[PDB]
Amino acid sequence: APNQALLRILKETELRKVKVLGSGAFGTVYKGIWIPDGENVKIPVAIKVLRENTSPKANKEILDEAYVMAGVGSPYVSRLLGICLTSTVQLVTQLMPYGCLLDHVRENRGRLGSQDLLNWCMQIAKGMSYLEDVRLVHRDLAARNVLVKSPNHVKITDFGLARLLDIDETEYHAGKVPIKWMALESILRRRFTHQSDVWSYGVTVWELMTFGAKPYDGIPAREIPDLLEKGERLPQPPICTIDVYMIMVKCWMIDSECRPRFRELVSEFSRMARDPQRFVVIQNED
Numbered sequence: 346a347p348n349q350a351l352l353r354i355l356k357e358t359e360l361r362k363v364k365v366l367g368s369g370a371f372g373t374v375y376k377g378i379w380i381p382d383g384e385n386v387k388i389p390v391a392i393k394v395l396r397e398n399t400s401p402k403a404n405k406e407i408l409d410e411a412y413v414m415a416g417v418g419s420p421y422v423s424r425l426l427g428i429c430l431t432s433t434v435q436l437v438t439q440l441m442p443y444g445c446l447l448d449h450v451r452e453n454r455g456r457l458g459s460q461d462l463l464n465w466c467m468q469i470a471k472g473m474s475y476l477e478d479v480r481l482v483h484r485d486l487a488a489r490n491v492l493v494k495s496p497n498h499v500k501i502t503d504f505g506l507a508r509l510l511d512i513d514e515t516e517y518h519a520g521k522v523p524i525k526w527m528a529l530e531s532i533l534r535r536r537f538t539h540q541s542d543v544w545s546y547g548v549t550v551w552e553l554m555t556f557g558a559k560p561y562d563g564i565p566a567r568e569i570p571d572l573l574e575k576g577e578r579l580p581q582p583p584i585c586t587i588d589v590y591m592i593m594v595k596c597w598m599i600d601s602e603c604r605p606r607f608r609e610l611v612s613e614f615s616r617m618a619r620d621p622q623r624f625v626v627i628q629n630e631d
């Protein structure tokens with residue numbers, strides 16, 4: 346397919362940093378205003394500024410992510426609006442007014458419904474399904490890396506650890522990593538596949554269904570491998586029916602072939618979203 350994605354290379358003076366939004370992976374994200382050259386409009390943006398010390402490998406990876414994320418793809422992935430190539434690379438994207446899903450669920454704990462949670466799980470799966478189709482392994486999928494455009498619309502973002510797989514490459518061999526969201530084979534053998542993304546997807550869904558609890562809270566990160574090989578997993582969130590929790594459990598099978606495919610997670614969460622109260626018992630949050 347002719348990939349007519351437009352990539353904008355912006356001068357730094359088109360951007361104004363207005364507020365610090367938080368940290369992404371390997372970079373600081375700012376709220377700002379992009380005034381595109383030749384235009385008088387003030388567009389609300391997020392601007393992620395990466396480390397200043399970047400190796401060739403890193404620059405190549407940044408440009409891969411940019412090659413994929415510039416496309417008009419899924420509505421459930423954040424689109425790269427443009428890059429500013431100063432000494433330090435700045436990545437520019439549409440500002441999502443409701444911030445990251447992790448904060449959103451924590452601070453809307455009392456008001457979020459079954460339908461919301463299930464829609465988000467579906468949309469994240471749809472986003473990841475799409476990334477799978479474009480050969481991108483995220484390696485860092487987590488509630489902190491999903492954004493809320495609006496209550497009914499989430500987007501996978503950041504992509505700080507994302508790797509584009511070449512033709513007939515099926516694993517990335519890996520640098521600091523999110524241990525508590527990682528598949529066992531990723532922790533132990535630094536192998537990253539779309540199937541180890543499914544594991545991270547399961548922890549994301551756990552995060553949402555617990556309203557942003559910390560996975561394995563108080564458990565040191567060094568004990569996580571051992572814990573997982575001894576068959577422990579994250580416990581059933583109070584609001585999950587066994588239906589929903591079983592899918593999570595399936596994401597955390599030690600054999601990566603026994604984990605769901607993202608297209609199956611799409612269909613399973615779409616089915617459940619149709620009758621949300623049957624699969625998420627929201628009253629159990631009390």
Ligand SMILES: OCCOCCn1ccc2ncnc(Nc3cnc(Oc4cccc(C(F)(F)F)c4)c(Cl)c3)c21
Nearest residue numbers: 366369391393410411414425436438440441444503504
């Ligand atoms: O970084 C994890 C979540 O960010 C919370 C900060 N935040 C709050 C509102 C908001 N709106 C838009 N973006 C945010 N953060 C953000 C995250 N990642 C970014 O980097 C990329 C975005 C898209 C595509 C790519 C790349 F490299 F794949 F092309 C990087 C940016 Cl710029 C902003 C927000």
